[PDB]
Design an enzyme around this catalytic site. Sequence first.
Site, PDB file in Angstrom:
ATOM      1  N   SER A  47      16.219 105.215 142.341  1.00  0.00           N
ATOM      2  CA  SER A  47      16.289 106.528 141.772  1.00  0.00           C
ATOM      3  C   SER A  47      15.982 106.793 140.301  1.00  0.00           C
ATOM      4  O   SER A  47      15.711 107.896 139.954  1.00  0.00           O
ATOM      5  CB  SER A  47      16.643 107.492 142.561  1.00  0.00           C
ATOM      6  N   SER A  95      20.136 112.821 143.987  1.00  0.00           N
ATOM      7  CA  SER A  95      19.139 111.814 144.342  1.00  0.00           C
ATOM      8  C   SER A  95      18.544 112.091 145.723  1.00  0.00           C
ATOM      9  O   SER A  95      18.528 111.236 146.612  1.00  0.00           O
ATOM     10  CB  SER A  95      19.727 110.402 144.289  1.00  0.00           C
ATOM     11  OG  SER A  95      19.912 109.973 142.953  1.00  0.00           O
ATOM     12  N   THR A 186      21.182 107.389 137.411  1.00  0.00           N
ATOM     13  CA  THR A 186      21.588 106.216 138.170  1.00  0.00           C
ATOM     14  C   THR A 186      20.508 105.816 139.171  1.00  0.00           C
ATOM     15  O   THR A 186      19.615 106.594 139.512  1.00  0.00           O
ATOM     16  CB  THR A 186      22.891 106.466 138.939  1.00  0.00           C
ATOM     17  OG1 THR A 186      22.711 107.615 139.777  1.00  0.00           O
ATOM     18  CG2 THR A 186      24.067 106.677 138.015  1.00  0.00           C
ATOM     19  N   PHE A 188      20.084 102.866 142.797  1.00  0.00           N
ATOM     20  CA  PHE A 188      20.712 101.921 143.726  1.00  0.00           C
ATOM     21  C   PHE A 188      19.694 101.603 144.814  1.00  0.00           C
ATOM     22  O   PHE A 188      19.399 102.463 145.647  1.00  0.00           O
ATOM     23  CB  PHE A 188      21.993 102.523 144.305  1.00  0.00           C
ATOM     24  CG  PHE A 188      22.646 101.697 145.379  1.00  0.00           C
ATOM     25  CD1 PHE A 188      22.769 100.325 145.255  1.00  0.00           C
ATOM     26  CD2 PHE A 188      23.165 102.306 146.508  1.00  0.00           C
ATOM     27  CE1 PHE A 188      23.385  99.578 146.251  1.00  0.00           C
ATOM     28  CE2 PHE A 188      23.775 101.569 147.495  1.00  0.00           C
ATOM     29  CZ  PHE A 188      23.880 100.202 147.369  1.00  0.00           C
ATOM     30  N   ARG A 230      28.320 100.183 137.728  1.00  0.00           N
ATOM     31  CA  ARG A 230      27.077 100.452 137.011  1.00  0.00           C
ATOM     32  C   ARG A 230      27.268 101.493 135.914  1.00  0.00           C
ATOM     33  O   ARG A 230      26.459 101.549 134.982  1.00  0.00           O
ATOM     34  CB  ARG A 230      25.988 100.918 137.983  1.00  0.00           C
ATOM     35  CG  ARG A 230      26.075 102.389 138.351  1.00  0.00           C
ATOM     36  CD  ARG A 230      25.193 102.719 139.525  1.00  0.00           C
ATOM     37  NE  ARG A 230      25.625 103.945 140.182  1.00  0.00           N
ATOM     38  CZ  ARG A 230      24.932 104.568 141.128  1.00  0.00           C
ATOM     39  NH1 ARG A 230      23.752 104.095 141.509  1.00  0.00           N
ATOM     40  NH2 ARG A 230      25.415 105.672 141.678  1.00  0.00           N
TER      41      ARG A 230
END
Lengths: 245, 246
Positions: A47, A95, A186, A188, A230
């Site tokens: 992302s 996202s 962020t 992932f 994170r």
Amino acid sequence: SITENTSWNKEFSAEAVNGVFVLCKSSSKSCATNDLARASKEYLPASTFKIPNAIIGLETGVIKNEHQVFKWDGKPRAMKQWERDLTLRGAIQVSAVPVFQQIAREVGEVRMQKYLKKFSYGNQNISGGIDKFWLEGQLRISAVNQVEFLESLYLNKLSASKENQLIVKEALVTEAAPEYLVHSKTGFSGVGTESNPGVAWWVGWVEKETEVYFFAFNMDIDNESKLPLRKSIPTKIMESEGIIG
Amino acid sequence: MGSITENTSWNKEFSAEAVNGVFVLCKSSSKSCATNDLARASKEYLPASTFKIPNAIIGLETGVIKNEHQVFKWDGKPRAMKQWERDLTLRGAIQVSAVPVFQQIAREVGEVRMQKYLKKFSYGNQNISGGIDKFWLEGQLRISAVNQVEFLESLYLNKLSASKENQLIVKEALVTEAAPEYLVHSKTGFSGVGTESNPGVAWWVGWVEKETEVYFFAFNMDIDNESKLPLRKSIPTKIMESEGII
Ligand code: NA
């Protein structure tokens, strides 16, 4: 120049995290990190790629303007949060993969390759499928490269109009205090596979008084339960440096 | 902008705190506004610090302000607020309401250009009498809450007579709360405590982006004591919270 800073190792040890934090004050000329080697190791952007993808979508006119609404066609999407009309900021904040997949399809491989070359974005490898190179493909970027790219964005120095860079920056605001302003994103990739963990990211910058700090964090991850680390590890470090909180 | 209706039910939040004030809330999709007091929504008040929105746009348009990375250097001489005695970005100057910074901007803009842009912006009564660096603080410039939301809607749409880039610059400086569900742009104002039976005014104006909707808002109140200042945000916040916007 990248300098190692052993003091931050404790924040990784506490949680048994294998990862890297890169933090640069004023500019990318001098960056500090806990791990010289990993700071420059390249990982799937996941992302975090929404940032260049949004700029490119706007530059090419695929995203018509900053008030574009991305309509939902009513078909199932992986998350309920994606099953609705979304603005650019809304799609970035949740996202919404399918929104950015369609942006990438309409940008197309030729233009996408050109802009990633202009942006010096990682290894610039978009091969294997135009709607998934940043999700499961061969595109890779390091934490150092992320802070260089974000510095360019902050300075309006990317190969894109200032308007479009300003539009994307507004969509990336994640914390507003009177003292400071945080832009972040962020990522992932997933939990990975046997002996091959996924990667989790948090990248952005902090504007505070007349100073700016660029940061990029990534970590190995094989279980979604570790995802809050994170944000919390880099937040701890930046708190201990007197940047936020 | 298209319609306005009075909503008595918000008076609850004013009466609870013994406040005389008005809230205007407009939903962009429906082009419809609601207020607790139609008469006060049209009354015009000193903009005070809410004027840092048009002043910054005009400063950028005229080139008096170079860009969002311009640093307004402190010359070292004292300032009323201790928060002003430092170097400041544009956002910094807007956020701490640094009066001398924007007085210098207004001086450099000059009366002729300031008059032209307030006409273009349809900004209040467009009266900048009283001195070029104080007309919005103690002079004759007045603006209503309804006019404030009209002006903020124009800014949000980049429809003011200014470059889109400069409107975007000022908008990024006005972000005050970012949540995953919504984004708030806002600006406070406070003219002072006024005189006997003539209170000052306190403002909170801005907009909220939530889902695919946009809400423009403008709040003002009589204020005769600095201790009441937090109510300029708590009363509108409670109203917008009860409307489900927060
Ligand atoms: Na999906």
